[PDB]
Amino acid sequence: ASQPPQVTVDKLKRLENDFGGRIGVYAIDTGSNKTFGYRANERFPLCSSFKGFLAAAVLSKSQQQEGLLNQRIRYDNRVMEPHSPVTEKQITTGMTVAELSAATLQYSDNGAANLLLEKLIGGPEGMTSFMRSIGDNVFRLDRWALELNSAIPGDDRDTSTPKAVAESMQKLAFGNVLGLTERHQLMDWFKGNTTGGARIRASVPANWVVGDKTGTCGVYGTANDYAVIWPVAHAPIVLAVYTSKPDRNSKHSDAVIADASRIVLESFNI
């Protein structure tokens, strides 16, 4: 009963032609294990979207270090990165590791990302090592939170593929690499993301549940979203949508990401 893959490809190519850039997608039906990809093994900049996996890396560490999520981190006199809306308000109080994780995922707080990278996960190298440890041999993080967003065509730094992003999200959400407590916490964080209203969430009926993490590099029309989607009485779908444009000075398009998501999800004929 699903749509022929070439129909879905044909629709995405027309969308690409309209957008004036490149669209890469991969989707997994976790109940039938049917999959769909388009440019699925092409590399795209992660932008801020790595932060969902950063939160996962923190939970993995906490599964081995009792009470890590409750540890308070203070950062008096630190120069905070732009787009740090949570951490810039909690300097006097400090934040716990759980609060920093929730902030980096749900608000795309760069300060929180770099705090967790510096103090817990071992920098871009350590973030990459965590992804290797779950069998993702594609992901790479090379730079810290601000600098990783240059999105230059041809530069493989701070990139992954739609396939690898979706496959790693499926592992973390539903597989064995995290314990039950940790899976549940990760999915609750994704469900409460606040930055994705115009992307994958905008492609699904309002009574479906979504957890997602976005990225918006701010250059080269480069932006993305990946998600777990729970349709009504259907197995969850994992979806990654990555985009870029050839011109440095172009703007990204939220609508193209929502439209690509819609095409892909409709192809499963849920």
Ligand SMILES: *C(=O)[C@@H]([C@@H]1NC(C(=O)O)=C(S[C@@H]2CN[C@H](C(=O)N(C)C)C2)[C@@H]1C)[C@@H](C)O
């Ligand atoms: C990461 O890519 C950058 C930040 N992360 C994201 C994002 O997750 O999309 C943005 S875009 C920001 C959040 N949502 C706002 C929005 O949608 N409107 C104001 C319509 C804008 C950040 C810039 C990071 C490198 O800073």
